[PDB]
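Obj.: predict assembly geometry.
Materials: sequence records (below).
Method: joint structure prediction, all chains together.
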Amino acid sequence: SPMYSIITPNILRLESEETMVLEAHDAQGDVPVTVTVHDFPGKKLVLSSEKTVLTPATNHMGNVTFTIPANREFKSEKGRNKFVTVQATFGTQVVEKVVLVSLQSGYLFIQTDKTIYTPGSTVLYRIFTVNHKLLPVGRTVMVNIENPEGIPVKQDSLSSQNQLGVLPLSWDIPELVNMGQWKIRAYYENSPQQVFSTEFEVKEYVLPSFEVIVEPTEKFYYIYNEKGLEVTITARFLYGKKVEGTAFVIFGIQDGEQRISLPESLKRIPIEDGSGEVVLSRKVLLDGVQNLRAEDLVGKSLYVSATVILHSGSDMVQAERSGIPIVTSPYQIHFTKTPKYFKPGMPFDLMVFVTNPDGSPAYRVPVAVQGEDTVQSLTQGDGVAKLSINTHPSQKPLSITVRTKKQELSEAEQATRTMQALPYSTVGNSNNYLHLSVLRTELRPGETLNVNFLLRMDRAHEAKIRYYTYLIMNKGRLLKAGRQVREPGQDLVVLPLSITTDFIPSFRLVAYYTLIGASGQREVVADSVWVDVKDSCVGSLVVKSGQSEDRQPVPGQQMTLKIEGDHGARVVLVAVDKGVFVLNKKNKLTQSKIWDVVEKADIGCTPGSGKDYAGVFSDAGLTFTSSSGQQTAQRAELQCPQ
Amino acid sequence: GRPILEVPESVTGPWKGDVNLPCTYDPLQGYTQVLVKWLVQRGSDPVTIFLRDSSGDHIQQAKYQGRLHVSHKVPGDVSLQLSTLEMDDRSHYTCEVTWQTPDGNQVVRDKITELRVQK
Amino acid sequence: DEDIIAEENIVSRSEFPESWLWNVEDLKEPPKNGISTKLMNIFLKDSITTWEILAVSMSDKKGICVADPFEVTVMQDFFIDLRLPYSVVRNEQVEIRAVLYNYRQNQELKVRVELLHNPAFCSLATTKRRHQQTVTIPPKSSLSVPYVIVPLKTGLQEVEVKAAVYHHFISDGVRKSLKVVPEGIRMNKTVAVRTLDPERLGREGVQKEDIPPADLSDQVPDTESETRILLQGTPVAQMTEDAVDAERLKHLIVTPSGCGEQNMIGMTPTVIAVHYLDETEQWEKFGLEKRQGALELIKKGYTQQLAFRQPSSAFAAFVKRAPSTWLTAYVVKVFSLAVNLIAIDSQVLCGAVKWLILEKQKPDGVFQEDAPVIHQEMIGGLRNNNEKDMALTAFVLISLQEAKDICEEQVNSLPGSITKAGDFLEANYMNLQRSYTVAIAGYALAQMGRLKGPLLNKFLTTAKDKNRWEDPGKQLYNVEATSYALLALLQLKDFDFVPPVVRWLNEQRYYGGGYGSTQATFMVFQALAQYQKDAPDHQELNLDVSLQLPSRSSKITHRIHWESASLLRSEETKENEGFTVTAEGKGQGTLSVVTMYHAKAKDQLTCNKFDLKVTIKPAPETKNTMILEICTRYRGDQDATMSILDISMMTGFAPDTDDLKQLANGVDRYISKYELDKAFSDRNTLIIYLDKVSHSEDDCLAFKVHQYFNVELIQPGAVKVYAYYNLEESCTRFYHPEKEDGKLNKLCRDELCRCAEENCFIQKDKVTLEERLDKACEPGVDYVYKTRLVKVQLSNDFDEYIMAIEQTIKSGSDEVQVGQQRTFISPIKCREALKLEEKKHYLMWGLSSDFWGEKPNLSYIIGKDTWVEHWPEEDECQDEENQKQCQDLGAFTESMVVFGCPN
Ligand SMILES: *[C@H]1O[C@H](CO)[C@@H](O[C@@H]2O[C@H](CO)[C@@H](O[C@@H]3O[C@H](CO)[C@@H](O[C@@H]4O[C@H](CO)[C@@H](O)[C@H](O)[C@@H]4O)[C@H](O)[C@@H]3O)[C@H](O)[C@H]2NC(C)=O)[C@H](O)[C@H]1NC(C)=O
Ligand SMILES: *[C@@H]1O[C@H](CO)[C@@H](O)[C@H](O)[C@H]1NC(C)=O
Ligand SMILES: [Ca+2]
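Observations (raw structure tokens):
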């Protein structure tokens, strides 16, 4: 029969366009479509809206886009996971489905003017309001200010309507108070369990006149290193010029949260011309862990506290680097990025992720499947190398073990890890597959990208594969979906997918073809693939000393700031005395600490593929369905399961 | 075809002396350069420390001001000259170059380089 | 001095934001490349440092975006860095560092640093003698100048120091400020912890609250006393008992099958499940797509039951059989609840009821059973033979009172067939011995708004142990009748007697299904359903706390609501008072009362973890050099680790070179190669590093301090220890020869102090008449007395001179009568210089700013600005030695008497 399909996101937000793709496979004629979305049980229709006409001048593909309105009766049953139906009427035919619903208007972000405030000072704070496309939007926001012990001493509920989603506020901190870590919590009136925060230290202080920066040669300690942890103090007057002074450093081992001092480590070096070397030796370390069985420090971090004092006596300041990973390898391999399901007989490409001991990426670092010398591959800028292997047509769980293959590092210094991948369960042992491959490069917007569409199946029915339909996930909603064609004789085709701002920070690919065979069985083989994109602002923003390049100004002087950004935007400025950071340099604002949310807040959960065809779609955050009965299973749980 | 940056992985240079963190390419016919960033990577996030646009050089962290003269007279060269070297200059530096093609659109190549300081 | 800039011509660097440039600028200019540019011009703050700037932009299409930091650094070739702390305690002598830097690349700088005089501070600077040093800073360097002061003025006070350089034009000046705070110590003394709860002994007459003043007679005067209030609102929400799990009711999906009475048997547990699963929202766990496969299994029953709909719109087993009074209503019951679920026909559901009222009723109102059904086991408690007339009247009637919502103007005598049938119950409810007819008629009477008094008591009390409504026998007519008892208690709105009835049925976890389950299954899930709709969502707060202090003018109506997601508030009173706290209706709330204040010190004060002693004495055998000794150690006797001794030196004093090198190579101690190679030109500050310091012993050291810059007065120095692991855990002792124990000369009574480091009184020769007549018509000359000294109460700290005013030559701000006595204070270090004696007469000037204490008890002070003069006695005037002065002193008076300063 002409199959009618209906893909939409696994979870649909509130006050949000969520698109939904309508397809009428193998069809004849203009076929109208009403689209309907009742609330769940007790059916009042929150969006009858949207209709269209699936003509044969796209090959019967179209869609419709709606907003689920956060109504009064979506504010009645609080704390249990809400629900909708989606009645996809295809004329005489109807194809409905049940979809989960997160409230989650959008994201919120909170700028402090600093990171630590003295009693009697006013905290200046700015709240940015954005729907999950990270656009600005107008809503209503409950804003709490909570004290040390977790108790709120001020509330508000403001409307960011007509403000470029930039809600400035102030809070005069009283002259007497509980010291400690304060909080500013906020939530959209419609999502009071999705609470965005931001902390800021209240503490008595004057500001220093210089900074310290402790840092080892290596971002880790190795245990069979006879030298010991080599460390460098560096100290500089906030105003650029170096220090002559005298420094007290000391070490200790952190272990969960328990921190152990190493009293006998406490050296007193003088500081010449800013810098000051120092070493926590091995023997002095190991003797302070009377656990004594060398290896036991594996995973136990180290920490250095310094305390630099000037030769006048006028000022001092402490500083500590917490978390030096005591390790048996300066690498670490993760299959966070690599799927967990292969395709029997076809390749299985391994997005190997690889890191230095502080969970950062390591660049140009060779990796290898164990059992496969010669074959190897280098990790690129982000920390991803791609390996790839031919699997045998049997359904045996895979057992891959990837090593680092650096020259310079003895084998026992190389890091390794290992995993298990499973076969995509074909529809009634038919051995029909689809495999999406993408070359391995730091993707920037403006470039264009090749997606290989590989088809593996028995040839008796492969001629009836006129297209792979595909869809794109970014930020939680469907970005785009189209058709990449294929005519017979082939096995691979290649989609030159144009890559724009709209894909940042990452995007998925879900694709599928439809075939009838064996006798009268409707088949749907699908595949996914998650692609990382270069994290960057969508727009752009700089501040520079526009006033004649260089020169160097004096107390009082008037200069000028080129601000260079997006036409029809609003910019909000702050300047801060670097001093403040010497105290607290935490919970400032970072584009990337945003993209963290955006991709903490995904709906997609698997790096690719699934246990079968259903898995493919619902892992990747979609809701395939049809008039034949082939569909994803219900999404019970709102969070990705881990 | 397109441009690629000849930037070496690890460059060593002595204490309180100079060094050339190379970053180069080979100019193509129409590929007009419009932005050269040097991004030092201290933490787990990167930051801009040099910048070049329609109006010359522009240093953006004071702890460099007057130490960092990027190399300008040669086409296909963006090497980071760097004098009176400090210990706190140990880091991974990026070289990021932006080109405009004729067809009123744009492309960007960046490569990364560790600066290590010997004694 | 020569070649310089005078103090009056030096402006201070004042502006010291920690954060600034908070601002909004919109990029309105037109896009070039698609990239817009605004040029903000900006004044810079005087803070010498580096400014990090961070921008964030918000755009219509291009979302949020954050720029990068951009550092802008503000610098000088020469400048000061005044190192004020955060706070400093009143009338406790403190030290502060003023750091100067010279960055001229190859240029020595001869400098003059000056502190400026502020009456908020005792300091060497007096208004007619500046505090100033002259020193030579080398190239690429800094140089610490200390300043030792006393904070007199509590609150927020200012500190200004400046400098110019010789043979050049460079100047600079700092004006930070630091916090002055009460002598004593911070205290929180509570005065009341009351519970706001109108009704619970807030009483019928709503909660009214008196709250007394604090203790307060060990208060340190001239200090704040904030009276705080903490209103909280303490809620507790919900008495909703757990739902019966979804994974358990899977067999209740019974496909309806059979005759007229085997269809409603099998329709119920599927029908009831829906109406329970709608209002628990549970479909989640059970399954979601499994609803649409159960809707049509209700509609199927519905339309399979539409066939038996007898000609007269009634219901029985077959169409051949006569109609059952019970099955009509029970169908009205099963359909009425399913009005939502599907399209039920209007003619039908209000057709079965019109059959019952017209045919099946008595005069008093009994709904009799003309057709005893074949499957009775389905009817639950109706199977017994006693009180059938009562319990069946209630069963048919219950369904009518659930089908009264829809059908209002189809059946006209419905406000009628329920009115008679209720009196039958209400009258004959109190002869029931069984739970069933008490639990089921009770629900029937609970839907009329008619169950009170003796009927309700019996209802609520027929429940054994306050939860279940039971009977003797088959234990399904008890999980049934207890859920007529729940549905009455939920139309009673009585959420006191409800929670147990549920809790019992969630322990009897009865999952329907099987033989004769019908009613048990129906009413138990129709009751544990309605519970989860109506039951308190969130126990209610609506406190309207009124406060009204006599201090303030107006009330303070602290509204309170659950929904207010803090439920926390505060009121700050400045003055301690008695204030009424009324409060009105609902909820429950906290009401703390606290006052911050300060009290006297106790005599084991705050050099907590470091005992420190310091001394200074003169030379050895043979300009003036002395022995600076430091003997220190540390409380909690575990040899403290690594430490600082920070020596500030005395104005133009310098340690010896040799002595220091003795101490540097003496083991368990250290002094750095920097501080040695330093010049004799400047060694005014010096740090001794130490390895160890307990209080087992006292670590004793000393050295020789060569003076090289001769001057009058001189400032003391200060040694100050701390361990490197806390610049809090510290102790700052002083030293200096003339005064001893380094302390500056001040004159304190009780609370406040007078900066006493200046002239005792107007100084010294000719003392001509003009010269006298002039100087007592300057600005602040408030009084002029001829005095006789009547007693001379010397002491250690301050002197006393009871002077009797012999005449007022010029009176003023103090209405003193002739013959009356006034006390004059003067510092001890002036004693010998004044040198007075009793019985003797004096001449006295003085200002208004010189008094001490309030009227009528105004003590005078002798300082820099008073004139005190020996006055020869009457007879002693005639003497060729006291001739001139005597004539002039008694010429001075006549001028002032007859004329008065001719201004
Ligand atoms: C279903 O709904 C989707 C939304 O999910 C609808 O999407 C339509 O998609 C197209 C392309 O994404 C969009 O833009 C038009 O396509 C042109 C492509 O040739 C665009 O030209 C240029 O594209 C360049 C690509 O890099 C770009 O650099 C350049 O700036 C320019 O954009 C041009 O923008 C076109 O307008 C449609 O606007 C969009 N529809 C809507 C409502 O805006 C789509 O209608 C539905 N999908 C299908 C296929 O049925
Ligand atoms: C008591 O005083 C301390 C400071 O000494 C303060 O932090 C705290 O808030 C006070 N506690 C009360 C009861 O408010
Ligand atoms: Ca990314």
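Conclusions so far: Chain B touches chain A at residues 9, 16, 44-45, 48, 51, 55-60, 62-63, 65, 86-88, 90, 92, 105-108, 110-112 (CB under 8 Å).
To do: check interface contacts against the pulldown list.
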